[PDB]
């Protein structure tokens, strides 16, 4: 299986400045949990912003850097060598990636948070006349999560 895991707000952007624009514990949790013993494919940069490999999953990075070795990080070179991973792939980021992957992908695993950040990487565009909502769940509010969040499951029609 090949899905799309992303948080994104209400105007699409899941990123700024090699950062998250919003601090969401949930999200996190949400992500740990869907991905923990299978596979993670990041673009470059992606992996870049976080700076390691996050544990108990495979950790997959794009890159045309022949040179690229970082130790927890398997290495691709093309969009084609996605396919040839085992097992339940997440598409993990970055904005380029979600662009080139979109429209191959079986499943997405969206968070919308519903808030209006300032960014420079965006998700790309996409109707609900293409996705059916397998599941709309919404995150709960806290001290510690502050905004208001859905986890969507679309699956394609
Ligand atoms: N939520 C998220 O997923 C987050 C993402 N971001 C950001 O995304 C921003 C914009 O960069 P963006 O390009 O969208 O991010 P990516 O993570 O997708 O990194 C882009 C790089 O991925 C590699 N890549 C992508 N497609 C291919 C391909 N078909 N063949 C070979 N290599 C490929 C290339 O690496 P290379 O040049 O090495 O060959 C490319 O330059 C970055 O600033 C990053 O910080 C920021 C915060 C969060
Ligand atoms: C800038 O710093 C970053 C840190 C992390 C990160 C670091 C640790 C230690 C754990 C976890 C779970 C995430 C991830 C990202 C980027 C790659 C992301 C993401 C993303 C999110 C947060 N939610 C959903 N739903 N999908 C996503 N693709 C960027």
């Given at each position: 299986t090949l899905s799309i895991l992303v948080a994104h707000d209400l105007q699409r952007v899941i990123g700024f400045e090699n950062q998250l624009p919003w601090h969401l514990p949930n999200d996190l949790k949400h992500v740990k949990k869907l991905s923990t013993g299978h596979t993670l494919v990041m673009g470059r940069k992606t992996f870049e912003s976080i700076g390691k490999p996050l544990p108990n999953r495979r950790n997959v990075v794009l890159t045309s850097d022949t040179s690229f070795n970082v130790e927890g990080v398997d290495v691709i070179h093309?969009?084609?060598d996605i396919y040839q991973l085992?097992?339940?792939?997440?598409?993990?980021?970055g904005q380029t990636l979600y662009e080139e992957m979109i429209d191959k992908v079986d499943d997405m695993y969206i968070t919308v948070i519903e808030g209006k950040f300032r960014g420079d990487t965006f998700f790309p565009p996409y109707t609900f006349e293409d996705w059916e909502v397998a599941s709309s769940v919404e995150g709960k509010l806290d001290e510690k999560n502050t905004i208001p969040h859905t986890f969507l499951h679309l699956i394609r029609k």
């Open positions: 093309s969009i084609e085992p097992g339940h792939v997440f598409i993990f980021g």
